[PDB]
RNA sequence: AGGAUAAGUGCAUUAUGUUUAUGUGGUGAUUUGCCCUUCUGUAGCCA
RNA sequence: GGCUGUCGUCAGCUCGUGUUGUGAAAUGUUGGGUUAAGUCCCGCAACGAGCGCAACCCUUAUCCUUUGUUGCCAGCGGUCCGGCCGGGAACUCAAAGGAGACUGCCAGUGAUAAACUGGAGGAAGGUGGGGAUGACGUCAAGUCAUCAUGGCCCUUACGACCAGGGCUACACACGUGCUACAAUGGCGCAUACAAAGAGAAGCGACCUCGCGAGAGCAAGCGGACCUCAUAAAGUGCGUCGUAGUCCGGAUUGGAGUCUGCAACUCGACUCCAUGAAGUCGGAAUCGCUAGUAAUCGUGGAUCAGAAUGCCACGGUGAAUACGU
RNA sequence: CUUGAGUCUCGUAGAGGGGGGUAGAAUUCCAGGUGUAGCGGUGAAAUGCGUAGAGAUCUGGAGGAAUACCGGUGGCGAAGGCGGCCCCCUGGACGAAGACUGACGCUCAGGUGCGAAAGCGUGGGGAGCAAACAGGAUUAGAUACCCUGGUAGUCCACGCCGUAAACGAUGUCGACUUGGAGGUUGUGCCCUUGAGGCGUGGCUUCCGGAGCUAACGCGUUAAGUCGACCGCCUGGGGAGUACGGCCGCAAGGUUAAAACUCAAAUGAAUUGACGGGGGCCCGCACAAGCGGUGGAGCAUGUGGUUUAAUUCGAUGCAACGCGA
């Protein structure tokens, strides 16, 4: 991004940028944080069986947003209803609702003060 | 086979012309390599259609190579079922090489005293629709116009296309699917 | 197989690729079967079988989107 | 089991040796025979300790 | 990159070693398979069967699968406190109740195998296919079927398991 | 396997129309044009200069046969035509395409291709 | 393919009881790292105190 | 005049996708098959 | 043991590791689209990395750039008008820094997309032209005969000094290549321009001898200095008609030469007279995308003596690449 | 008693059984009319048929098997078994309300009864196809492969011992265990809104959960959880034969074995290779061409063949202008 990737064969140095920026927005998750997080949250069951897969293997609790052509076994938290869009991926999942927002209110006396604001 | 298209590369011209016509016929009239006899066998033979007629020294050269000239061909194609043939249009480019090459076979064999007079005789011959490659003109544009009904083992892909989505026409193709 | 009516979109040629479905449906459709009484239902009568690779191909135009290849 | 040549079509070519030496003519073959006998006979002679290249130089 | 089970003692037992063959399809390569059992003492569900080029880097691939997806499991006294035939995939092999005054009876790498499993002495016989691949299983499904001492009265023996979540 | 196309050899009907029956198969063509009381005015078939093998049912053997019978009944003066088919074989529509261009109306292309009930039992020696 | 660096080469030949082992080894220290460089001047220009002999300039 | 659902313009070889001769038996890659843990323990085998 | 040929430039293979199955083992390393490419868009248990491939690399192409001889010459002198030399630096020109061109742009194509093709200025566009350039590895593949080497044999020999004979015979078949069968060529006469390289027991101007090749002597040389070297085909004009000719020139008689006492069979080159096979060859069958292919000469490696080959160079220099 | 099962009327689906009735059209034939040379067969092919007039076509008669498409993964029968359509005689199943009986139940050694098909006695019948038998085609042949004539046979009915892949592949029958949907059907409800949905049963099939398998696969019709009660197995080959009892005009059928041989035989699946099953891809490997070896002669290597010996190494691609 500085613009210091320069080869006096351009090819071989944009062919390796697009590369880098698929790295970039497949990565872009864990890249800017701390390490393994504390719970998976798998939106998608259809097609993104290996995020499931993995999470099971880690040990690491799943939230799940489970579809009619899934089961809601197999998995330590559901919200039944639809994989695609706003319909139950941050209608329940953001500052709309209150029961993501009363669970964090139980974040304020245990490991911080004060961090309600980060979080939907 | 092949990994992409590669197309034809540039040719250079001749100490003698600037004009491609000349410059294409006396490079496929080139034999031993050597093109600089050439250029004077295309202009020998030029002068001499010339004396025949005035009014061009183009006169039997322009309607020979339009008349021993192809348009069409067949090739032969078949993995099961019964023998088939499939047609193709092919390239102006070697329409026109076909027909300079059985130019110049015809000629150098027709045994007249100087190559000059061989190939104006010779275009003089075919001009006229009755030379020596009137015929392979003929029949082999017969053989490709006719084979235009069959297709690559028709019997099989006939069920095959419309179960894979397609047509439920009868259609000529490149070795698939009809 | 022509048919007597024409096409849609027609012209002075009949043809049968348009506008037919029942015609030599289990007459000619045959290839040396001789004369049977139960054999068809598991040599012949294979609708069951030739269902599922055409529900196959319909399923495939869906997942072809979902993976975004368009 | 093809084993391709594995370092001596690979030389010369901003890639350095373990001669450099200048000769040419007839006379090559007597400065070459010369400079085989010389990296045979001395790394014997300081073959006390353990050795990492050998280069030789006229 | 994984949580990981240990036991405070080594176990390395290797069970099978083979090797891998496409033939033509780059023809042969030198690559072992590798099967290889880690237990605890009072048994585990760990079992590794893992591959590379030599043998030495395909077994330690094999033990490091022998103790990822696998969790150590436990059984007080070296009997098991029920007579029942654990069965896994056509390899089946029986227990009953016995004495501490026998310790193993078994041959080959299986005596092995159950000195950690804690099922040694009531060790019966085993019956459908026992070469090592399979044979091995003991600790496994034969604590999976497993019973364990608790109670202080056999007449309360039933009326403890109930209580202990209601 | 052409009737006469020269006049006076043989007897004529001159009646300006006719119909044809087009018996369609996988291994041959009989088309044959006959006049409007049921009186063959001349035939023609696929193997009418020798085609064999799968190429003598096919379009273009299809096709030279339609053209070798609509030749000859212009010499038993007809002028129009009408047509039966008789199979889902190949070729049955290059003939159709071939009677219109020797120069006749093809208006009228009746399907009366006939049902075998299957009385017989077909020709097997084999696995299949 | 690699034709850039020296990069450290050695066939072993030696026998025992049994008869005769052997070891290649290919040793890879670096693709512009050890060996020369090419230079980066021509020689023609460098260390030229006149610049001339005659050349027609006097 | 019901051969008039006009093809429900839902349609595509329509259910065996077939056939023109064959050629012996075994054979490559290791003699430490060894480099993860206290106690309850392990690969020739040990804390 | 060392070493190497194959698949193939296949377009894939492998190293560490997880996972799914009881596992053998897969997966990746497989699909679609795209490529020299594991390159690049899409995507499933593959993740991370290396190999093949890309790269650095030497070379060319204009063109910038410096040296200015053993290289060059627009004007100028000696002058037969030759850089031989007084002299000059515009100039190629040699070897090297390199510049320029990146599938980067635009347009079409392509699933958005890698990338292919077209488009253009320019010396030059298809990852600019050329070359380097080829994975793990089965194949019991081939060398114990470069060389290494045990088990294991001779060591008055399975060692070693000396002469002569033979592979290269000739019956033919077979691999490869050479030059012809034509006239795009040969001939006659007249006429032209190279690149590159080899020469310290060597070659080598002049010399005298020689039908020519060469010979012995020798200034000279270190090869951009001197010599192989008249480079040939090609070019100019005229000529030739499928007749073995106006193509081809083998055999053979007979003379002259080379390294060496010593050229007969086994060696090589020059030259005089006559003169045959061969009309583009069947089954079979390969190489080639452009300095290629074809074709003509040249030098060199080898090298006691000598080439039709190979290897590299320069002359003259092509058809087309739809399609699998 | 009903919580098992049995039974009446009412309704409904279907090729169950036994016996009757009936139409159109391809192959095939005859006749007459019209009309001329191939027709047939197949991978391609020949044998075959045909000028004594074939093939085809109009009109009209002949005849027997056969009956599409609807027809489906449907449904029926005891399992195998049942197929044009309809009725008569009658079975067995599927639903629903009124009504009744009230363990009348479960399994089954022995047992009697009972056939897809051909085999097979007699009667009916024969258009096409066919073992055999001939002949073609294929090839080391050619009995397999493929075709053509051509007979018993096929084709009908009963009858004689009932053979088999004679099956919810899974004994019999029943109770219990998350469903959803397909085929198709009683019936309540719907815009009766398309083989649909919901309510409640039906056989019958896809899909997958608890549980099960070695794998395929099963999963409410189990291969789950089980129940009672009967059948049957103890490595393979040799053997579903021998041997024994029995039935059968008659070939046969039926349960079902060893010496001997032998370390296996056998269920499943991975990857390579491979399809001649389906489909995809590449190298100047072809093509698009051009030239070359193979033919001449020569150069040079190979073998053949030869002598004292004409030395080996190497044998399409991976030997032969290569070690050498």
Known sequence: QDGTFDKLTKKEALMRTRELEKLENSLGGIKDMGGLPDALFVIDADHEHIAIKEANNLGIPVFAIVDTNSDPDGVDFVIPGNDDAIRAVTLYLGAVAATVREGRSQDLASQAEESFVEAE | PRRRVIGQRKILPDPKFGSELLAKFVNILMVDGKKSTAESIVYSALETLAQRSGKSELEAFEVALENVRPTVEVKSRRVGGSTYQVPVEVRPVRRNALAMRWIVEAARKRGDKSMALRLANELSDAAENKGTAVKKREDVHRMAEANKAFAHYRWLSLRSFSHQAGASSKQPALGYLN | ?70 | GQKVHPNGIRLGIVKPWNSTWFANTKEFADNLDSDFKVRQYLTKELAKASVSRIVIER | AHIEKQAGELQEKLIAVNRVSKTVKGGRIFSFTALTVVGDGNGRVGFGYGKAREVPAAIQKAMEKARRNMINVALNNGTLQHPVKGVHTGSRVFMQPASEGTGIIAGGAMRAVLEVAGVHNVLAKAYGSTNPINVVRATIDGLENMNSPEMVAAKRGKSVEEILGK | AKAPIRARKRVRKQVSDGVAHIHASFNNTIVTITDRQGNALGWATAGGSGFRGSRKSTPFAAQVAAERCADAVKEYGIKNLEVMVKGPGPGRESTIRALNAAGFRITNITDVTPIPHNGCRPPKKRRV | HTLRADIDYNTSEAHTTYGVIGVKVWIFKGEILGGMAAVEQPEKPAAQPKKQQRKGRK
């Open chain 3, 1 to 70: 197989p022509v048919i007597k009516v024409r096409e849609n979109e027609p012209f002075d040629v009949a043809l049968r690729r348009f506008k037919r479905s029942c015609e030599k449906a289990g007459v000619l459709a045959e290839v040396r079967r001789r004369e049977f009484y139960e054999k068809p239902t598991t040599e012949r009568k294979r609708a069951k079988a030739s269902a599922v690779k055409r529900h196959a191909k319909k399923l495939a135009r869906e997942n072809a989107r979902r993976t975004r290849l368009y």
